[PDB]
Scaffold this motif. Structure first.
Motif, PDB file in Angstrom:
ATOM      1  N   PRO A   1       4.739  69.931  80.146  1.00  0.00           N
ATOM      2  CA  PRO A   1       4.175  70.471  79.008  1.00  0.00           C
ATOM      3  C   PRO A   1       2.784  69.908  78.748  1.00  0.00           C
ATOM      4  CG  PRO A   1       6.316  69.977  78.348  1.00  0.00           C
ATOM      5  CD  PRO A   1       6.125  69.386  79.799  1.00  0.00           C
TER       6      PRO A   1
ATOM      7  N   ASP B   1       8.548  75.661  78.729  1.00  0.00           N
ATOM      8  CA  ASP B   1       7.146  74.969  78.277  1.00  0.00           C
ATOM      9  C   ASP B   1       6.519  74.335  79.571  1.00  0.00           C
ATOM     10  OD1 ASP B   1       9.256  73.003  78.197  1.00  0.00           O
ATOM     11  OD2 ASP B   1       8.676  72.072  76.546  1.00  0.00           O
ATOM     12  N   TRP B   2       7.421  74.257  80.766  1.00  0.00           N
ATOM     13  CA  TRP B   2       6.851  73.859  82.136  1.00  0.00           C
ATOM     14  C   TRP B   2       6.254  74.927  82.696  1.00  0.00           C
ATOM     15  CZ3 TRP B   2       7.871  69.014  84.956  1.00  0.00           C
ATOM     16  CH2 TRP B   2       8.534  68.101  84.232  1.00  0.00           C
ATOM     17  N   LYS B   3       4.868  74.727  83.239  1.00  0.00           N
ATOM     18  CA  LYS B   3       4.586  76.022  84.139  1.00  0.00           C
ATOM     19  C   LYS B   3       4.833  75.727  85.584  1.00  0.00           C
ATOM     20  CE  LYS B   3      -0.135  77.652  85.818  1.00  0.00           C
ATOM     21  NZ  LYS B   3      -1.418  77.583  86.519  1.00  0.00           N
TER      22      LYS B   3
END
Length: 266
Positions: free
Chosen positions: A226, A202-204
């Motif tokens: 996120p 969910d982290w870019k």
């Protein structure tokens, strides 16, 4: 604590590890061998693209560069598909970042001009950003092969992190050039097993890798939570005591990144 976890990874992978994450509003800085020199390898290609962007108008992206198949002296997955036609600056930036094309990088260095095939100009650009430590002296593929202890072609985790933060989160480039650099790094094909692998999905993550002899493996990244909160992560490593042919250990960087991510969540 973090320092002990990082030391355990050094022991486990028979490696020297360097880590820097700048402070933010809510988080302390993280630093482990952060002022020790590590070889750039291809991590330099991100600020290289920034230099090329900075020094010319956007329209310079369509300038055609020509080159021969003799000019290909390093793994160049994109440049070796386009010898007859040439490549535009824009395509060279794309190749340099996303497939870590070595010929693309050398052509971009030549586009900066001056002595050393553009390495002095590149070092100049980093000075203009307030990086006083880093230096580049050779082209690809030589810049991946300097013996341990040699300061040529080196940076530090601290220095390279602050450069990357200026380029992607600060104002080193105006928003239109910035978005290009950010997008190329966002669609990098070479980094899945490094910083990316230690941050939850969910982290870019945008990044640029580096790999070389003496067991050299780096990754420099900007990551977003996120809920959209940004962090800069520089992880560098080598296994120089195992000699010129020491294998790089991608898992070291993923595990170091996992430590970073755990700390940043709390």
């Amino acid at each position: 604590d973090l320092a002990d976890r990082f030391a355990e990874l050094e022991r486990r992978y028979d490696a020297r590890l360097g880590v820097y994450v700048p402070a933010t509003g809510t988080t302390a800085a993280i630093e482990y061998r952060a002022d020790e020199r590590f070889a750039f390898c291809a991590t330099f290609k991100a600020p290289l693209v920034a230099a090329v962007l900075h020094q010319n108008p956007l329209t310079h992206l369509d300038k055609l560069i020509t080159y021969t198949s003799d000019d290909i002296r390093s793994i160049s997955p994109v440049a070796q598909q386009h010898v007859q036609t040439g490549m535009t600056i824009g395509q060279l930036c794309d190749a340099a970042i996303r497939y870590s094309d070595g010929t693309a990088a050398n052509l971009l260095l030549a586009d900066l001009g001056g002595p050393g095939g553009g390495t002095a100009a590149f070092t100049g650009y980093l000075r203009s950003l307030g990086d006083t430590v880093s230096r580049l002296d050779a082209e690809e593929p030589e810049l991946n092969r300097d013996p341990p202890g040699d300061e040529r072609d080196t940076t530090t985790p601290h220095a390279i992190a602050l450069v990357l933060q200026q380029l992607v989160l600060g104002n080193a480039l105006p928003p239109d050039k910035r978005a290009l650099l950010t997008d190329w790094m966002a669609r990098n094909t070479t980094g899945a097993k490094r910083i990316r692998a230690g941050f939850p999905a969910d982290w870019k993550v945008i990044d640029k890798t580096g790999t070389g002899d003496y067991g050299r493996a780096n990754d420099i990244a900007v990551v977003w939570s996120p809920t959209g909160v940004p962090y800069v992560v520089a992880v560098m490593s080598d296994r120089a005591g195992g000699g010129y042919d020491a294998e790089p250990r991608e898992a070291l960087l993923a595990e170091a990144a996992t430590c970073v991510a755990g700390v940043l969540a709390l």
